[PDB]
Amino acid sequence: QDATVYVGGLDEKVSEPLLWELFLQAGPVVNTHMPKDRVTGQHQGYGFVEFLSEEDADYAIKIMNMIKLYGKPIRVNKANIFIGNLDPEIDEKLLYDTFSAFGVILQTPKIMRDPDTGNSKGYAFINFASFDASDAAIEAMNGQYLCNRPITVSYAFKKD
Amino acid sequence: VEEDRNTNVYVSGLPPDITVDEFIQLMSKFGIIMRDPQTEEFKVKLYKDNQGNLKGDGLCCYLKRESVELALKLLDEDEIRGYKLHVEVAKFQLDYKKKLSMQQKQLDWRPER
Amino acid sequence: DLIFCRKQAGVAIGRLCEKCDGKCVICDSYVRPCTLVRICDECNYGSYQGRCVICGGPGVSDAYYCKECTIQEKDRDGCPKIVNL
Amino acid sequence: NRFTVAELKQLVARPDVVEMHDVTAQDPKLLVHLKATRNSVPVPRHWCFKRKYLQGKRGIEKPPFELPDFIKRDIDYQKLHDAFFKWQTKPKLTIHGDLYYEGKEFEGDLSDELRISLGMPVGPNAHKVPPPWLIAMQRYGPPPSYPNLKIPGLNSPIPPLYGDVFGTNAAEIDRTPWGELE
Amino acid sequence: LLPRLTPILKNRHEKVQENCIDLVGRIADRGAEYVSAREWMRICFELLELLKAHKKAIRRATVNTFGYIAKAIGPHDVLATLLNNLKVQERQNRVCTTVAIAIVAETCSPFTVLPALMNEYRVPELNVQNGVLKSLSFLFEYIGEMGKDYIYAVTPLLEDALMDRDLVHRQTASAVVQHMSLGVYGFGCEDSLNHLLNYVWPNVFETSPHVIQAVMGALEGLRVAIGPCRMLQYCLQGLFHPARKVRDVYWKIYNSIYIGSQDALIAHYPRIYNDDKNTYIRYELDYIL
Amino acid sequence: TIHSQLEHLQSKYIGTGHADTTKWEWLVNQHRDSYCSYMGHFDLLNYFAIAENESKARVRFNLMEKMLQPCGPPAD
Amino acid sequence: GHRVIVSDVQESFIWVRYKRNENQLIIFADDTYPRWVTTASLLDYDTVAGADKFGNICVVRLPPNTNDEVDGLLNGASQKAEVIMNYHVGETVLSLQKTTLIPGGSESLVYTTLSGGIGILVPFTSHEDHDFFQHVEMHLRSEHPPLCGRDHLSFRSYYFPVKNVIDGDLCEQFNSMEPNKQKNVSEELDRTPPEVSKKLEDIRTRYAF
Amino acid sequence: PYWLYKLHGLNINYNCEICGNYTYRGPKAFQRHFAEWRHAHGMRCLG
RNA sequence: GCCGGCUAAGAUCAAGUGUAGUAUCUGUUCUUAUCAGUUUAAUAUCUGAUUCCUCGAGGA
Ligand SMILES: CC[C@H](O)[C@@H](C)[C@H]1O[C@@H]1C[C@@](C)(O)/C=C/C=C(\C)[C@H]1OC(=O)C[C@H](O)CC[C@@](C)(O)[C@@H](OC(=O)N2CCN(C3CCCCCC3)CC2)/C=C/[C@@H]1C
Ligand SMILES: [Zn+2]
Ligand SMILES: [Zn+2]
Ligand SMILES: [Zn+2]
Numbered sequence A: 001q002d003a004t005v006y007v008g009g010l011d012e013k014v015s016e017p018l019l020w021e022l023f024l025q026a027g028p029v030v031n032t033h034m035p036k037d038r039v040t041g042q043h044q045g046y047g048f049v050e051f052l053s054e055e056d057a058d059y060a061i062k063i064m065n066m067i068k069l070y071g072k073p074i075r076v077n078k079a080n081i082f083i084g085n086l087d088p089e090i091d092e093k094l095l096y097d098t099f100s101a102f103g104v105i106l107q108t109p110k111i112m113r114d115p116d117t118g119n120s121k122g123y124a125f126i127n128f129a130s131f132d133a134s135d136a137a138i139e140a141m142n143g144q145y146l147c148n149r150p151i152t153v154s155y156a157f158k159k160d
Numbered sequence B: 001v002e003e004d005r006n007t008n009v010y011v012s013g014l015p016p017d018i019t020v021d022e023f024i025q026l027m028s029k030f031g032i033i034m035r036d037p038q039t040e041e042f043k044v045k046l047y048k049d050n051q052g053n054l055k056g057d058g059l060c061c062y063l064k065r066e067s068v069e070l071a072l073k074l075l076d077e078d079e080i081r082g083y084k085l086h087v088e089v090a091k092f093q094l095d096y097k098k099k100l101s102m103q104q105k106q107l108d109w110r111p112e113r
Numbered sequence C: 001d002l003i004f005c006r007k008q009a010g011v012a013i014g015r016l017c018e019k020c021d022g023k024c025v026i027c028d029s030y031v032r033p034c035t036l037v038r039i040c041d042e043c044n045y046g047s048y049q050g051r052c053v054i055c056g057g058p059g060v061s062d063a064y065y066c067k068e069c070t071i072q073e074k075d076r077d078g079c080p081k082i083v084n085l
Numbered sequence D: 001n002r003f004t005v006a007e008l009k010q011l012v013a014r015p016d017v018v019e020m021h022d023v024t025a026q027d028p029k030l031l032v033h034l035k036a037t038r039n040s041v042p043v044p045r046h047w048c049f050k051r052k053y054l055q056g057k058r059g060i061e062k063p064p065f066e067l068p069d070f071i072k073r074d075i076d077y078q079k080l081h082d083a084f085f086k087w088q089t090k091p092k093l094t095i096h097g098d099l100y101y102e103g104k105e106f107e108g109d110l111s112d113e114l115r116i117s118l119g120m121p122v123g124p125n126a127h128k129v130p131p132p133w134l135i136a137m138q139r140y141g142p143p144p145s146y147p148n149l150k151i152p153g154l155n156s157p158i159p160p161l162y163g164d165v166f167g168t169n170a171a172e173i174d175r176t177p178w179g180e181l182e
Numbered sequence E: 001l002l003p004r005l006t007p008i009l010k011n012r013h014e015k016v017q018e019n020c021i022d023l024v025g026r027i028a029d030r031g032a033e034y035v036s037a038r039e040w041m042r043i044c045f046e047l048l049e050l051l052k053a054h055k056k057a058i059r060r061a062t063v064n065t066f067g068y069i070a071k072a073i074g075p076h077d078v079l080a081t082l083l084n085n086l087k088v089q090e091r092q093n094r095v096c097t098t099v100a101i102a103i104v105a106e107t108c109s110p111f112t113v114l115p116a117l118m119n120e121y122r123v124p125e126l127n128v129q130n131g132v133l134k135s136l137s138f139l140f141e142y143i144g145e146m147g148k149d150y151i152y153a154v155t156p157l158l159e160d161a162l163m164d165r166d167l168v169h170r171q172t173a174s175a176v177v178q179h180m181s182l183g184v185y186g187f188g189c190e191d192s193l194n195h196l197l198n199y200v201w202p203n204v205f206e207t208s209p210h211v212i213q214a215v216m217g218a219l220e221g222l223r224v225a226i227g228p229c230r231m232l233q234y235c236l237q238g239l240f241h242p243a244r245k246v247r248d249v250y251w252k253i254y255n256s257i258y259i260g261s262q263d264a265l266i267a268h269y270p271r272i273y274n275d276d277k278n279t280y281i282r283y284e285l286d287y288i289l
Numbered sequence F: 001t002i003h004s005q006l007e008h009l010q011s012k013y014i015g016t017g018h019a020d021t022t023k024w025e026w027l028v029n030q031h032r033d034s035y036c037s038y039m040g041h042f043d044l045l046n047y048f049a050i051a052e053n054e055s056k057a058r059v060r061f062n063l064m065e066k067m068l069q070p071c072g073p074p075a076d
Numbered sequence G: 001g002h003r004v005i006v007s008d009v010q011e012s013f014i015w016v017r018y019k020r021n022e023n024q025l026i027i028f029a030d031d032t033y034p035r036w037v038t039t040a041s042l043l044d045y046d047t048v049a050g051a052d053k054f055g056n057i058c059v060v061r062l063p064p065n066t067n068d069e070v071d072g073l074l075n076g077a078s079q080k081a082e083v084i085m086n087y088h089v090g091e092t093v094l095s096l097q098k099t100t101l102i103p104g105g106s107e108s109l110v111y112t113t114l115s116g117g118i119g120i121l122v123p124f125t126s127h128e129d130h131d132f133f134q135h136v137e138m139h140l141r142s143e144h145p146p147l148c149g150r151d152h153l154s155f156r157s158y159y160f161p162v163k164n165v166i167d168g169d170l171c172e173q174f175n176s177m178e179p180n181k182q183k184n185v186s187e188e189l190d191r192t193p194p195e196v197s198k199k200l201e202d203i204r205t206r207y208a209f
Numbered sequence H: 001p002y003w004l005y006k007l008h009g010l011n012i013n014y015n016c017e018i019c020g021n022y023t024y025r026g027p028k029a030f031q032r033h034f035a036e037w038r039h040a041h042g043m044r045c046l047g
Numbered sequence I: 001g002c003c004g005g006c007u008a009a010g011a012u013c014a015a016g017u018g019u020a021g022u023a024u025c026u027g028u029u030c031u032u033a034u035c036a037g038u039u040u041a042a043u044a045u046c047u048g049a050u051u052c053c054u055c056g057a058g059g060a
């Protein structure tokens, strides 16, 4: 897990030897793994590249971070408001700093991860201090231009 | 509905002294003739007049379609000793698994000797 | 009981009948006859003088090994006459 | 009056070829010695199985037969014969000892399609058009995993870059064969 | 003359038949441009039944005349018709069709027959692939030395047929391997033959008599084409296996390898070290002038 | 019964084995036909006679004498 | 210059590299046949000609895939070498050498035998000469068989099958056949006996005397 | 399928001291255990 | 084959049908158990010995 780098944000043009060919300049990528879905039978955008040394994986994570690969925000990492279609290049501290401009955050946010890879699932949950920050996130942040990924902010629970 | 997959062939015109055995030989020269599953007596029909008179027309159904297309390009416009035959895909206008599998096993490639 | 004789072969030439004329005695092939068949002296004697080596009918022509059997030196065993017990 | 596996492993020069049943042979020392000869592929491995050499799993259901490339590219004259003997290639072949068994069928440069899908323009004549991963290499330094790699702008000059080649590896006789047709 | 001549081919006298076939053969060899190709097709389809004749001269003349007619009208149409006929008929007619395909492929180079025959193996239906395999078997047996240019083309098909669960598939593929091995010998085709041996060998533990017979035939053909050293290398580790089944099979194969080419094996035996009681090293071969 | 006859003829040929063949029989068989092959091939005997500095008749006689009991006497 | 070739008494050939800066001798290739090597000759950077105690000559070449920079699959080395030539001579060869014999001629492989014989193996330069000589050998194998009952193809395949060698000692026996059989042989090659004789003499005078 | 119990090799148990005297079942599983995690763990104990 | 398991993973003993040959189908049973011998690469197989609980009954 230390020598392997988890890549997120892969489109349909990216393939299993294509990621190994793109990561060959960063370091000696020994193997590439792409988990296939059960309903569609294709990649879900997240994969893994197992290299030989941890320094090559660190250089690939520091070089290929927030890159625009196949029209997709590909990024390598070390393997009541709901935000969907978020970029995997952002972290919890980056999401807390991005959410601090609209309103005040009550605590540190959390992002959902896949049970197989564990880098990024695609959705996240963040809680605001009051309902005014949630309304400002649903008015402004729900549709704002993020890092090559159109996010969507919505309410997790609402009572009619 | 079934446009192709028609294993029946229609022999337009034949000598009026045609027997059944000479006809089934003519037809067996081009493949295996399908047999009625409940019985013997290959599925071959000699069309007859209101009497014993022979109209001179014949029907023959085959096991497979390739044998039909074989008879089409080898029997059509070919002369038996006296007469000129005509061959066409038969027109129609108006137990099972056991013997099906047997006739299939007639095409086997099993070890002999 | 289809067994070859496998005795020391002599100067007698093997014969084939009208039904077996083109056949190879060992593998029953019909392609490329190559080597003349020799039989032992007990297979060539008296009433056995001219006889098919495969079946035993009246011989009409020479028996041959095929090129495939000649390449594998299967013509170097004994008398290839089919004998029944 | 028969060896144990660990006892026989102590006697032989090569213990990793010893197996469970090897101690039950009539002459295990000769068996293990022949198992270590510098050749001699081993036994087909399904002698002890109980499934008649054809595994009924692994999803063998697949395409019937994929003809070679030379198959596709009167019916064809001596010119298409010329084509079939110019296109004829040698297929993949396994060497002397690679036996088959039931299971063993399933188990600086960028492509033009990936560069077109990623939104990267083509290489100009005399300018600086780096990939977006090259800015991190120009800021932090060269990668220690591949020190011999050259990039345009940092180590390679701008006029280099030609087509889709955005990098080159520069690693720091009488090679002609002897008897060959002319 | 020829349309008057074609009904005599069905006469049942031997001299009449032989002379008629010879005459039609001469006509097809020299005067081929005087009669339509459809009548030639009918005549060849009629000649198909004479390959079963009880007499050798009839078969010889029929082979000659079929070769001439095939050389005349072209391989494409006759090959299509022969494949259709191989698909739908009884045993003897299918065997005669196989012989006819081999004849067509020998007169008109097998380059013209092999693609259409391999395209028929692509049909997803048994009893069609087995016919293609029998035709390939007889084709290689019939062309012999000419096959040295076509071993690379049929290797993946033989791989597929040897990986198959059907027994007739593997038996016929073994027969093909045997005929191909004995056909090319001294022509430098050892790579593909070793590759195919890697797929033939796992079938030695087969109980079915026909399959094991074909496997033994293929092994004895590879003993000639590939050499006894490779066969001894395949037998060494099983000669002294703990199981009696493995020992029986391997000693049968070894005795077959030993009876043929006993002399070559002298240079191939592996070194066996002396024990306390007995001396096993051959010291003369260790001399160094 | 043709296969059974082949199984009896293969056993008949001297030098063939079976599932009960021991190491000693195998090794003496290959030693014996090695000595016969040396006697047959003219340039192998030349090599040996040059190597050990003997006449070729002497090497032939030595090989014939070694033919009797190669690999020592059998077990038990 | 870079590599070392080792001959084993019973194994054929081992390829070794000397690491000048690491002071290491590493085995990176070997063969798949047992050979009782008597002598060896380097033909180029990848190919070796070998001889045998049993009277055989062979040529072994490294595949183009071969990696030299190494730091077993058959209880041997990881990479293997391919055999591209096999020939039985009938006598034990003790000397092999690549050289040019006549002034202004071509390079040949000269060998020497324990019975006092001297011979050469020369390469073909075109496919037409190779095909013509192959057909000559094929037709002379049948219509002029060896005198003591031996099969010619089986004799040159004594220990290993022949690979890519034409027996020119069988081919030059054409000049000593009777005119009727010389015509029967020549009319199959679409040629006359004098043309075949001239073609046989050309390849000999190109290399040797 | 009590018949598979004795046909596949069960009811015959093997134990390994390198693996906590862990007793394994029929030979197909017992031969595979040396590659599994628990045996690697037990072997690392000795080094 | 499906998401370790759902007893389609094996052997066997009687009968029917049928082929030149291979075969195909039904009832079954499958020791749920131990020891000794034979045997098997190891299984397998074969050869012999081996009072209580519950509501007259059943199970061990
Ligand atoms: C697998 C197929 C079957 O075994 C099948 C042959 C056989 O089971 C049937 C029964 C039966 C009696 O009908 C068989 C028929 C026989 C044949 C079709 C053979 O024809 C003959 O016997 C004719 C005659 O004996 C000799 C003709 C001949 C020399 O061409 C012979 O074939 C050959 O020897 N070849 C094969 C090699 N070929 C090349 C061509 C270049 C120069 C000639 C030699 C090399 C030449 C012709 C016959 C071939 C038929 C298979
Ligand atoms: Zn034969
Ligand atoms: Zn007969
Ligand atoms: Zn006899």
Ligand SMILES: [Zn+2]
Pocket (backbone or CB within 6 Å): H016, H017, H018, H019, H033, H034, H039
């Ligand atoms: Zn353990």
